[PDB]
Design a protein around this ligand. Structure first.
Ligand SMILES: CCOC(=O)CNC(=O)NCc1cccc(-c2ccncc2)c1
Ligand SMILES: CCOC(=O)CNC(=O)NCc1cccc(-c2ccncc2)c1
Ligand SMILES: [K+]
Length: 164
């Protein structure tokens, strides 16, 4: 089946809780596998110890730049970037997990969790999973963002991995 993975998140050193995500390996196997391995750290790099660097209330929470912590970095398990796999899954509502990019075929490690329906991203960002548990935790992260995307506290993925 599809992988179930987790992110444990803190704000300025204080735990907010766990986000559990289903990865849609049945639809986007290559994209799902990238995120799964970045969660476990099994390639020798990944999300543990990195930040939510861009958080916009009433839009989305963005993370995955584990090299530069600002949207300019990250890398995939395949190399520095990889193709858009497909656009079969849509941005249907809050809790959608989708790849950030700088245009067509620029996927690396950066990703976002939607806090609203972001359907204007359909066909432009590859959706690859959704929140199974911890939308309340995502809403806590969202509260520390701003309309500019800058966060008011340091929001850190203190642990992550695979449940099944
Ligand atoms: C949105 C444009 O700017 C960025 O992406 C800049 N990176 C970024 O803020 N990373 C998250 C981070 C990294 C290091 C420290 C803090 C922080 C510490 C204390 N109080 C507020 C924020 C936050
Ligand atoms: C709501 C989602 O917003 C975004 O995706 C906004 N763009 C954004 O943050 N780009 C920076 C970025 C994000 C992800 C990957 C690359 C990248 C990777 C490899 N080779 C070129 C670019 C660059
Ligand atoms: K806006």
């Amino acid at each position: 089946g599809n992988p179930l993975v987790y992110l444990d998140v803190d704000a300025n050193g204080k735990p907010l809780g766990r986000v559990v995500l289903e990865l849609k390996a049945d639809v986007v196997p290559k994209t799902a596998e990238n995120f799964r391995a970045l969660c476990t750290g099994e390639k020798g790099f990944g999300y543990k110890g990195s930040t939510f660097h861009r958080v916009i209330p009433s839009f989305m929470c963005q993370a995955g730049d584990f090299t530069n912590h600002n949207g300019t970095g990250g890398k995939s398990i395949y190399g520095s970037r990889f193709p858009d796999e497909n656009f079969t899954l849509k941005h249907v509502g809050p809790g959608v997990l989708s790849m950030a990019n700088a245009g067509p075929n620029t996927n690396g490690s950066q990703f976002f969790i939607c806090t609203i329906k972001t359907d204007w991203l359909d066909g432009k960002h590859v959706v690859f999973g959704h929140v199974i548990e911890g939308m309340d935790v995502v809403k806590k992260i969202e509260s520390f963002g701003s309309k500019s995307g800058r966060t008011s506290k340091k929001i850190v993925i203190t642990d992550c991995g695979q449940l099944s």
